[PDB]
Design a binder for this molecule. Sequence first.
Ligand SMILES: [Mg+2]
Length: 203
Amino acid sequence: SMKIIGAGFGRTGTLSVKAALETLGLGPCYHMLTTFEEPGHLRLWNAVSRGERVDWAEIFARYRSTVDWPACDHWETLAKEYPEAKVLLTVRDSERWYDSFRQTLAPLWSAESADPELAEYLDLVRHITAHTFGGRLDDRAHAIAVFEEHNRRVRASIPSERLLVFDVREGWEPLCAFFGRPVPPDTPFPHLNDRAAFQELLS
Ligand SMILES: [Mg+2]
């Protein structure tokens, strides 16, 4: 069974959170980039996005946690599928979130590719764009409004004993306290960068 359902949007330090959760023994942790490493997973996520019934174990059987897209948009159904899992809402200053989103994802998500190998990913992020962002990615006011409303929704649905709201600026102490898992003294909190994986996809 899944232990942790990550409900925060991408660009909230998710690759660093992924690493931190794995260090605490709470992985393997799924991330957006896992969909490229798991054969057939983008097909399954597109089926989920279309509203089809998919057995969640076909995606998550070998995982114990998830962060980022694509799963964050499905936090409500995943929290009901895995009732014992905790929910982790990764957050960030809204201006910095949008800066990172427009520097990292908006060009890619807005692109066309002849490459049949990006086609499934593009289908998925086109769905997210339509369903979550109302068809616009290049508008800071609207995108920040979407981010802030998403975070409000999660906080208003999941009971506060089951939800941890976390920004990577806070470091280890809140994860370790919420999950009751130690990290060695003087361990720096991971600050990892996945920008190149997305920026290099098109080329
Ligand atoms: Mg790690």
